[PDB]
């Protein structure tokens, strides 16, 4: 049984030394990073915190992020484990209607 301290599904040594996700047939593999074969495919190299279930502290595990098992609305640049995925919600008031309360 491979070690996994943060319980996120990515093995610790993979998280520290680098890794990547790659479909082979129609299934995704979580391969450890390899210069000779992955770099040609344009696969991103991922590093994350072995001890944090989410490295960015946002509510999506590093595994969920890199494999895409995630809320799809999460914008693609935030799919990367080191990029925090959080809402920024501001309200703007398009116009204000007062009605005088007069008998």
């Amino acid at each position: 049984t491979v070690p996994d301290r943060d319980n996120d599904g990515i093995p610790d040594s993979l998280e520290v030394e680098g890794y990547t996700v790659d479909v082979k047939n129609k299934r995704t593999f979580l391969s450890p990073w390899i210069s000779n074969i992955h770099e040609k495919k344009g696969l991103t190299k991922y590093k994350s915190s072995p001890e944090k279930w989410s490295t960015a502290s946002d509510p999506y595990s590093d595994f969920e992020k890199v494999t895409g098992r995630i809320d799809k609305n999460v914008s693609p640049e935030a799919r990367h484990p080191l990029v925090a995925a959080y809402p920024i919600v501001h309200v703007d008031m398009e116009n204000i209607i007062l009605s005088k309360n007069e008998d």
Binding site: V16, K47, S48, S49, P50, E51, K52, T55, A56, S57, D58, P59, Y60, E64, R69, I70, D71, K72, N73, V74, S75, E77, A78, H80, P81, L82, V83, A84, Y86, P87, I88, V89, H90, V91, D92, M93, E94, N95, I96, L98, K100, N101
Partner: protein, 153 residues
């Protein structure tokens, strides 16, 4: 959102948390609610059950039709996280957990980078960064600024 209507400089007319009428089910990033083609929602009421008008008194009413200064602050925003369910793959919203639990955690452990090379609109990303004094935070991968620019923007 907990909006607050402010007369003049900083005399707060009223603080209103949104009611069921003003609730927005989803708000995907780079989206408006209601969607930008539709007319904006009406905040009318102070009551939990949306049954009382947002009242304003005489001096406030006179000051408003004179100066016409009515700012709207956004004190805070309530909302829930939808999380992926490994079992049947559906994303589900936990109404227990909410973003106010998560956001301060994010702001306290990530470098913030605001950047406006995209048509001079500010874009704020947050990149996980080592915190030397916090033992758990040193376990994050080292973050050069160039790497941050590449992966975030």
């Amino acid at each position: 959102p907990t909006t607050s209507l402010v007369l003049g400089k900083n005399q707060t007319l009223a603080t209103i948390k949104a009611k069921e009428n003003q609730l927005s089910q989803i708000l995907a990033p780079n989206n408006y609610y209601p969607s930008k083609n539709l007319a904006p929602i009406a905040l009318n009421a102070q009551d939990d059950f949306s049954s009382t008008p947002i009242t304003m008194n005489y001096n406030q009413f006179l000051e408003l039709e004179k100066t016409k200064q009515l700012r709207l602050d956004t004190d805070q925003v309530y909302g829930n996280i939808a999380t992926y369910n490994f079992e049947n793959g559906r994303v589900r919203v936990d109404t227990g957990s909410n973003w106010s639990e998560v956001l301060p955690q994010i702001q306290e452990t990530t470098a913030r980078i605001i950047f406006n090379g995209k048509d001079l609109n500010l874009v704020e990303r947050r990149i996980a960064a080592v915190n030397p004094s916090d033992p758990l935070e040193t376990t994050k991968p080292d973050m050069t600024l160039k790497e941050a620019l590449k992966i975030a923007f």
